[PDB]
Design a protein around this ligand. Sequence first.
Ligand SMILES: O=C(O)[C@@](O)(COP(=O)(O)O)[C@H](O)[C@H](O)COP(=O)(O)O
Ligand SMILES: [Mg+2]
Lengths: 126, 126, 126, 465
Amino acid sequence: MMVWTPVNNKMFETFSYLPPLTDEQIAAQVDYIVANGWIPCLEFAEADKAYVSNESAIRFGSVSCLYYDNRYWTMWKLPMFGCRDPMQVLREIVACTKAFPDAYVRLVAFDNQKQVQIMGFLVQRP
Amino acid sequence: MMVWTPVNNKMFETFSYLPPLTDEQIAAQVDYIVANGWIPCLEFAEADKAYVSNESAIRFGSVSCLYYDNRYWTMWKLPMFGCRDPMQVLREIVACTKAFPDAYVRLVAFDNQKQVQIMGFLVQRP
Amino acid sequence: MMVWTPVNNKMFETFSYLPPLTDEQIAAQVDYIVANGWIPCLEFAEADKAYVSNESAIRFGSVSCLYYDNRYWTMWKLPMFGCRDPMQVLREIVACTKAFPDAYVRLVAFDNQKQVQIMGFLVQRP
Amino acid sequence: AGFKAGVKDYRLTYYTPDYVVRDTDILAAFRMTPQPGVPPEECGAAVAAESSTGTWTTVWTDGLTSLDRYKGRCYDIEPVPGEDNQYIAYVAYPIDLFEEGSVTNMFTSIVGNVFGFKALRALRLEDLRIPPAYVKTFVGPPHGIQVERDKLNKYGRGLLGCTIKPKLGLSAKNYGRAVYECLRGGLDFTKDDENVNSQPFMRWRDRFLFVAEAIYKAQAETGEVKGHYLNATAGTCEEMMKRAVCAKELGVPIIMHDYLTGGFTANTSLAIYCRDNGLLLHIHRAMHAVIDRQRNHGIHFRVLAKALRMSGGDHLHSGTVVGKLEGEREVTLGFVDLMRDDYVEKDRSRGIYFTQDWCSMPGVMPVASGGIHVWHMPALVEIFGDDACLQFGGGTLGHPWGNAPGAAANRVALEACTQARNEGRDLAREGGDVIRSACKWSPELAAACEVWKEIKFEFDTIDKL
Ligand SMILES: O=C(O)[C@@](O)(COP(=O)(O)O)[C@H](O)[C@H](O)COP(=O)(O)O
Ligand SMILES: [Mg+2]
């Protein structure tokens, strides 16, 4: 029996339980975005704003249900509407992480027909 | 596209989005106070009391609407009732900032007919 | 006009606005306890438990009115029932402050007919 | 004084041109266009009669009461210069005719039936004199301009807002995303579009929660108080109140209501709720131009603005003058004073037919919104001064770099104009120079300046004095 550690073992949603994505594996995910016509977007957060938290509920009555702080991160530029070139997405990952080398950075993609984010994973951890 | 940084980018209301006010620009604002017959006043706060916060809402029921801590700062002396000399105002800015060199300091002015603060901007950052 | 500083200026109720009590002045207050037949007692608190705070109101509904944490401090031994000797009160002050040299320490006295604390002042600051 | 059955002219009872108006009378100025063959005196008298105590034939029950005490009175008629069949008819209404605190009741008398009379071709209510004794029966605005600035801790410049776009079709989470990005760049406020209520693409409570997250995120990031006007406009008063309650329980600062499409009865209730619970109330004037656009018929916006001040609102849209929706300068300056000030003297050059004494009822913040961008900033600051909210929806969400840069561009433009004005610069003459200078400095502003440099809205005005 191996014990799953509770210490320093925070996760970042999809693909957090796999080995860290290689550059090739990230590029394959970008290809999947482009193949399905989805809208790439980058988002980032400083460490203090990267993890779900509850501090704004101090201002509430009994209405905290499915309210959390830090679900929203900061948009890098705009969603890449009309982008069908995986190399452009990869270049923006480089630019975002260059500008914010200490930030958490995630690559997401939007579907405008379901009007929902349809993929996402972390591409940089401080 | 340039990205507006979310990191270490806190603001202090009027004139925070312009270049730092030189002394001449500050003096010009003082002249506008005097030209309009408004009442100059200085206010200051230590860094821990300078930024809007929510900690007193722990004591509340569902009445936090438009309640924030740290809107009030500390008054420097009294409002300069009857002051029509810009150099007196400028001297008080120097005196306040010398007494509290690590404080945030703002110059405000009051209109007693509207009974409201009618101008204000930061003159000192720690 | 002199400006009353808001920074690092916390007070401790009765006699905080006077010059620090001399040993003669403390002795005179102990005499007043004994002359009036009141019950001397010492109380102490570590720095984190010395000032009024509000943390327990997180567990409350709308019932925080006149509830504060840290009004109670820790009793030194027991109230000195039957003490009519100022030497004994001054001895315990020394004893309490030697045992807890990093603590805030206050001397209080109780009136059992009103059933209320009838005097009190800080005798030690960390 | 015997009862005599049958029809007689309205002017025998209701045209009293030597009447001295009382200081408690409500006065109305009607722009009246009679049918051919109907004398102006009779037309004015019919308007007075059928908005007060009279009907088309003599009734015996008049004799049980005192028609002298209660009747509306056409007390003056003046021909309109430039018009051969238009008149201004002035009618005085005893204060006893009106239900205390009810804009609904006041409108029901004054504009209830008279606009449909066959004997007139057109009728426009231009102004109302609301006497202090009637003003004092209203709760009025929840807070008003001074209190709003004090609650927000915001002084020394116009407030800045922004309607989220597309008007409809965004999800709740995308709404909050857009809001966060707008607020964090320097806007004080964002808002639901007037028609964003609760719909299949976005249900209201979902939006309220995600907007709350965005408000608090932008406030923590910037250190400035933020708000987003969450729309309480609803199909029923119960749904309106549920939405106001949710805003209260989220601790957020401001809601909005569409006072004309929701209606005065619901608006007044909501204003009272906002007073009792500390919420700012933004009022959107949706539908007003159905009523107020044409010079010959309807109700001038200045009357709709007085009515809102009475029913209650902390903000009210005032037009822009220079944007996509109509609002002539002098007309607009006049009703802005009527919205904000305590005492406004008669001034027909600004369309103010009556001296208006508000007897300390709080002033309403004018909101300039619709088709404005950074190059309009000097004109807006010049027209409105500091006590206004200037809103840039397309002018923020249409910035080429996104909402935060769009917000920053507007905030820089406003602050640069405000600083220039304070330094002695004439924004009417030097406004373009002020903006051009700030464009060169701020990259975010420069991008807005370039995209909207040639965009103006200059058309013939319909609502002319
Ligand atoms: O729906 C609109 O068009 C707006 O959201 C403005 O959008 P933009 O900022 O994108 O123009 C406002 O509601 C109008 O200003 C209302 O008109 P008014 O203020 O005249 O009542
Ligand atoms: Mg709108």
